[PDB]
Amino acid sequence: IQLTQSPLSLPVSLGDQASISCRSSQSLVHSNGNTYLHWYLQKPGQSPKLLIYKVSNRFSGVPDRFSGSGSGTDFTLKISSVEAEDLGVYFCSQSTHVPTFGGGTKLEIKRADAAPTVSIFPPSSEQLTSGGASVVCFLNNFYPKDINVKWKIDGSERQNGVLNSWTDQDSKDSTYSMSSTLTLTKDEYERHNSYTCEATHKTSTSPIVKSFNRE
Amino acid sequence: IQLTQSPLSLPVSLGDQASISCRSSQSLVHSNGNTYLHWYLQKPGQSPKLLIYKVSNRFSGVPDRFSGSGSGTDFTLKISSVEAEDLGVYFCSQSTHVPTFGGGTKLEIKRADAAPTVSIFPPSSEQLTSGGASVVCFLNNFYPKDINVKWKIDGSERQNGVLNSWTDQDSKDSTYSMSSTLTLTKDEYERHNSYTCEATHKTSTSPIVKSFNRE
Amino acid sequence: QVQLQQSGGGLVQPGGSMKIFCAASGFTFSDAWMDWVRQSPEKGLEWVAEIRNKANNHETYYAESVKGRFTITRDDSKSRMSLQMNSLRAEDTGIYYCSGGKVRNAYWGQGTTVTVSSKTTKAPSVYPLAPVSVTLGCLVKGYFPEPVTLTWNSGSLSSGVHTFPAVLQSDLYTLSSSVTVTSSTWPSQSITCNVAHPASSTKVDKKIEP
Amino acid sequence: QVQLQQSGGGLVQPGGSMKIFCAASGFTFSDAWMDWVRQSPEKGLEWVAEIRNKANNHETYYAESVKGRFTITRDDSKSRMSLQMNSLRAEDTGIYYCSGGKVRNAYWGQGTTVTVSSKTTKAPSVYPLAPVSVTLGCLVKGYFPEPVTLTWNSGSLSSGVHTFPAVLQSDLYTLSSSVTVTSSTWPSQSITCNVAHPASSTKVDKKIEP
Ligand SMILES: CC(=O)N[C@@H]1[C@@H](O)[C@@H](O)[C@@H](CO)O[C@@H]1O
Ligand SMILES: CC(=O)N[C@@H]1[C@@H](O)[C@@H](O)[C@@H](CO)O[C@@H]1O
Ligand SMILES: [Mg+2]
Ligand SMILES: [Mg+2]
Ligand SMILES: [Mg+2]
Ligand SMILES: [Mg+2]
Ligand SMILES: [Mg+2]
Ligand SMILES: [Zn+2]
Ligand SMILES: [Zn+2]
Ligand SMILES: [Zn+2]
Ligand SMILES: [Zn+2]
Ligand SMILES: [Zn+2]
Numbered sequence: 001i002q003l004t005q006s007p008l009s010l011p012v013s014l015g016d017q018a019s020i021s022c023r024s025s026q027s028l029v030h031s032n033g034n035t036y037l038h039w040y041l042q043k044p045g046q047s048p049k050l051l052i053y054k055v056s057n058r059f060s061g062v063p064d065r066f067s068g069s070g071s072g073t074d075f076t077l078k079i080s081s082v083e084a085e086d087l088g089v090y091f092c093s094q095s096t097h098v099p100t101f102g103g104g105t106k107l108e109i110k111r112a113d114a115a116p117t118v119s120i121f122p123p124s125s126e127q128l129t130s131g132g133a134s135v136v137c138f139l140n141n142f143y144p145k146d147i148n149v150k151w152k153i154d155g156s157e158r159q160n161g162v163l164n165s166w167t168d169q170d171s172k173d174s175t176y177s178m179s180s181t182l183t184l185t186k187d188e189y190e191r192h193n194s195y196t197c198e199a200t201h202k203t204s205t206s207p208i209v210k211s212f213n214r215e
Numbered sequence: 216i217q218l219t220q221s222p223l224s225l226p227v228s229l230g231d232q233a234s235i236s237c238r239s240s241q242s243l244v245h246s247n248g249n250t251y252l253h254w255y256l257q258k259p260g261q262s263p264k265l266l267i268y269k270v271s272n273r274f275s276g277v278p279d280r281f282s283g284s285g286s287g288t289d290f291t292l293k294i295s296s297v298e299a300e301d302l303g304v305y306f307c308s309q310s311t312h313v314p315t316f317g318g319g320t321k322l323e324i325k326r327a328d329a330a331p332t333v334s335i336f337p338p339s340s341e342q343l344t345s346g347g348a349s350v351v352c353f354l355n356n357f358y359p360k361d362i363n364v365k366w367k368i369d370g371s372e373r374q375n376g377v378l379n380s381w382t383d384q385d386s387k388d389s390t391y392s393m394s395s396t397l398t399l400t401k402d403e404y405e406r407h408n409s410y411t412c413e414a415t416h417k418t419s420t421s422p423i424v425k426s427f428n429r430e
Numbered sequence: 431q432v433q434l435q436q437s438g439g440g441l442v443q444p445g446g447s448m449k450i451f452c453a454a455s456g457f458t459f460s461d462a463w464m465d466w467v468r469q470s471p472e473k474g475l476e477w478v479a480e481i482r483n484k485a486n487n488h489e490t491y492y493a494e495s496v497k498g499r500f501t502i503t504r505d506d507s508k509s510r511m512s513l514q515m516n517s518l519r520a521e522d523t524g525i526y527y528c529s530g531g532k533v534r535n536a537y538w539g540q541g542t543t544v545t546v547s548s549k550t551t552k553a554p555s556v557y558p559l560a561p562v563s564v565t566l567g568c569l570v571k572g573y574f575p576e577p578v579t580l581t582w583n584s585g586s587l588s589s590g591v592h593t594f595p596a597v598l599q600s601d602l603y604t605l606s607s608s609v610t611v612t613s614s615t616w617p618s619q620s621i622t623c624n625v626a627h628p629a630s631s632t633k634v635d636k637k638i639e640p
Numbered sequence: 641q642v643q644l645q646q647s648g649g650g651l652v653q654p655g656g657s658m659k660i661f662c663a664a665s666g667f668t669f670s671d672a673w674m675d676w677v678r679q680s681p682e683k684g685l686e687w688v689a690e691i692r693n694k695a696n697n698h699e700t701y702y703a704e705s706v707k708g709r710f711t712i713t714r715d716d717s718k719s720r721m722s723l724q725m726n727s728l729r730a731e732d733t734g735i736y737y738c739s740g741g742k743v744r745n746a747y748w749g750q751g752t753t754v755t756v757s758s759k760t761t762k763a764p765s766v767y768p769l770a771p772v773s774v775t776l777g778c779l780v781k782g783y784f785p786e787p788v789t790l791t792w793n794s795g796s797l798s799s800g801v802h803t804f805p806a807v808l809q810s811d812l813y814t815l816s817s818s819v820t821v822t823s824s825t826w827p828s829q830s831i832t833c834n835v836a837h838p839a840s841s842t843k844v845d846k847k848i849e850p
Contacts, residue, residue, distance in 0.1 A: 036534075038535060040535075046540075047527050047538040047539060047540060047541055048467075048475070048527070048538050049538065050533070050535055050536050050537070050538075053533055053534070053535075053536075059533065059536060060536075091475060093475075093535070095534060095535075098477070098491075098493075099465070099477035099480075100477065101474065101475040101476070101477070103474055104474065104475075117565070117610070119561065119565040119567070119608070120562060121559040121560070121561070121562070121567055121569075122562070123557075124557040124558050124559060124560070124569070126555075126557050126558065126636075127555070127557045127569075127571075130555070132571075134557070134569060134571065136559055136567060136569055136606060138565060138567065138592070138606075138608040140565075140592055140608065140610070141592075163597050163599060163604055164597070165594035165595050165596075165597050165606065166594070166595075167592060167593075167594060167595070177592040177594070177608075178594075179592075179594040179606045179608070181569070181604060181606065212562050221438070221449065221451065222449055222451065222503065222512050222514065223503070223505045223508060223510060223512070224503045224505065224512075225514070226501050226503065226514070231516075232447075234447065234449075251744075253744075253745060255745075261750075262737055262748040262749060262750060262751055263677075263685070263737070263748055264748060265743075265745055265746050265747075265748075268743055268744070268745075268746075274743070274746060306685060308685075308687075308745075310744055310745075313687070313701075313703075313704075314675075314687035314690075315687065316684060316685040316686065316687070318684055319684060319685075332775070332820075334771070334775040334777070334818065335772060336769040336770070336771070336772070336777050336779075337772065338767075339767040339768055339769065339770070339779075341765075341767050341768070341846075342765065342767045342779075342781075345765070347765075347781075349767070349779060349781065351769055351777055351779055351816060353775060353777060353802070353816075353818045355775070355802055355818065355820065361484075361487040361488045361489070362487065363485075363487055378807050378809060378814055379807070380804040380805055380806075380807045380816070381804070381805075382802055382803075382804060382805070392802040392804070392818075393804070394802075394804040394816045394818070396779070396814060396816060415487065416487070417487060417489060427772045
């Protein structure tokens with residue numbers, strides 16, 4: 001049996017209510033009358049944590065803000081008065097038959113818009129003294145999570161050899177961070193001298209530019 | 216110095232390989248160059264028998280199916296083509312410092328799966344004539360090892376006064392046997408007439424039941 | 431306090447074997463229904479195996495994908511259970527979680543990483559990132575497999591820190607961390623990047639020099 | 641053929657004393673590093689004491705928990721060693737093995753049981769278990785201390801026998817055994833249970849009558 005979750009993502013303002021749905025391909029009603037449906041929350045960097053079992057039974061420790069409902073093949077998790085710590089991926093699961101999970105629903109917290117603090121770093125002497133070259137760019141504490149990063153070498157865009165990494169939403173301030181690493185051969189790196197990390201974000205009308213020149 | 220042995224239980228099929236670890240809280244290497252780590256096997260009903268000494272040296276009479284390896288604080292016993300005669304509890308030990316032992320690993324031979332043969336026995340004339348009453352139930356040659364025995368007197372369950380005992384795994388057929396003894400006072404025994412031994416085992420959706428009627 | 435701590439994970443070659451364990455405390459183990467659940471980019475959360483109550487004869491059930499290859503085990507008196515894996519495949523790779531309780535799946539451990547590889551284990555190169563208030567960095571490049579632990583000033587420096595999830599490319603991982611302090615703080619006070627990579631027994635300190 | 645036979649164990653009251661012995665043959669005793677090792681459900685196997693080579697002048701060492709209470713001694717001319725135990729505690733209870741060889745711990749005896757008590761030694765009651773192909777039983781009830789020896793037709797009948805380990809309840813052991821034969825065997829051929837309990841000096845034979 002498959003369980004389908006919607007929506008894939010869910011933006012919500014603090015204090016507001018949120019609603020998730022998870023659908024089974026078969027009825028979850030066991031022959032013994034009970035419906036074995038679970039809701040979990042997986043906060044960033046942590047394992048899943050049981051919220052609700054048997055459809056609407058709130059597990060020990062779970063705030064009454066979380067409530068389960070539904071029957072047959074249709075179930076819903078409601079969160080009223082969303083706190084920032086609520087963010088993460090929500091999962092439903094059925095153990096009426098052989099255990100299966102939903103694909104999860106990521107809850108995102110709405111906030112006021114924040115420009116990224118951008119910082120660029122040339123390869124370290126240590127790395128260079130090993131025949132390698134990595135240019136690194138941090139784009140920290142921004143919102144919304146949509147951001148476009150370009151690497152420009154001598155004005156010309158480079159997409160090969162880029163490694164991007166995002167942090168999950170930080171419940172502390174509800175922002176996002178990002179790291180972009182441009183890796184080149186030592187010889188290629190020394191063939192140019194202008195290096196640029198370029199971010200396009202809602203918070204700025206023009207590209208947010210951070211550059212350095214070699215020598 | 217502690218010798219941490221993993222795992223506690225090791226189910227392996229005939230012919231397959233089994234691997235056992237024991238780990239020391241300190242290096243087992245002695246300042247003289249030698250590492251004094253032993254492996255033992257304790258078959259059911261017998262004393263520990265040395266398999267390997269000094270990390271990898273087989274003792275006389277030990278087949279080279281058994282091999283030891285490792286160094287410093289990390290050591291491994293390997294058994295290829297596991298034979299049923301291999302079943303039992305394996306121990307490591309070190310005598311580099313004050314001698315200590317691992318907590319052992321029980322090698323269990325995998326096999327098909329068998330339902331128990333159940334036999335119930337009324338109190339003997341001899342016991343009754345002395346004022347005592349014991350009802351006995353044998354569950355023989357079953358696999359796997361977990362099993363539930365419920366005693367019913369006149370349809371009602373009776374859990375106080377029950378004595379249970381399991382044999383070790385039998386290397387002849389790789390099964391387990393169990394004895395359950397319900398002890399009542401004689402008067403209490405003669406106040407009822409239906410006595411039931413109820414065996415719930417993996418091998419059947421319903422219990423194997425055995426009973427007798429006084430009179 | 432309820433605690434589920436996994437252990438024994440790591441790197442294995444395809445066709446290889448591995449044993450992982452779960453140590454339980456803070457609840458009556460024998461009463462608890464236990465599970466192994468694994469997580470991966472593909473497949474997401476997928477149930478692996480279960481071992482039931484003693485009341486329920488420690489009955490075991492396996493996902494069909496691991497049936498015959500994985501053996502689940504438990505010792506109630508030791509409050510311990512294990513997953514002993516054989517003939518491991520690339521898709522067995524994932525984060526393995528120990529889960530259990532009187533209520534099924536009530537508790538979950540931190541998880542242990544199971545990675546079936548062929549790739550060889552490599553120590554990371556640790557590069558200091560000095561700036562061109564002030565933001566410093568640490569680049570951790572070319573290690574296999576996961577995980578590494580990165581810290582700043584042995585943990586003493588935690589606020590203003592952003593550490594990013596490792597990313598794999600050509601059999602190698604790279605990791606980065608940034609820390610933002612005030613100009614009055616550095617280079618006046620030394621700031622040093624600490625990285626451990628158990629798989630290859632590496633611990634590296636890199637001081638951020640102007 | 642190397643042989644090690646322990647003896648002299650048994651039941652003693654807490655605070656009591658006891659001496660156990662090991663007799664050896666099949667090897668040059670004076671060349672042998674000898675040990676005493678005990679085993680119990682709790683603690684498992686613990687090294688107790690050692691006594692070294694003649695070459696090492698019979699130097700002796702003790703586990704810290706028995707230091708001062710136990711004395712290990714040997715006589716090479718008699719291929720014999722002994723362990724004198726004073727002020728025994730409940731946790732001194734277990735199976736004591738004699739062990740030794742040119743190679744340390746190469747050989748192990750059958751062990752001898754040391755049980756420190758308070759509980760009173762008690763003769764068992766032996767009851768024949770006749771059936772309601774065919775399975776017969778023998779119940780050995782209310783004895784102390786261990787062990788008893790149970791045999792069928794004096795050990796003639798070994799195939800199809802299941803002897804279950806004594807279980808202790810309220811200072812008293814019960815032991816049982818079953819034997820399964822073919823219908824054409826019994827009751828035509830007699831089958832009898834033989835039980836010995838040295839501690840109380842009882843030898844009894846119970847014939848299973850239809
Ligand atoms: C209602 C219930 O307990 N169902 C269980 C299911 O959870 C799972 O344990 C399966 C074996 O994997 O057996 C049952 O079908
Ligand atoms: C290598 C060696 O001889 N080690 C012995 C150890 O075996 C044990 O005899 C102990 C005294 O109990 O002394 C030494 O540490
Ligand atoms: Mg309320
Ligand atoms: Mg409320
Ligand atoms: Mg200690
Ligand atoms: Mg048998
Ligand atoms: Mg449940
Ligand atoms: Zn260098
Ligand atoms: Zn210690
Ligand atoms: Zn009654
Ligand atoms: Zn079990
Ligand atoms: Zn040795």
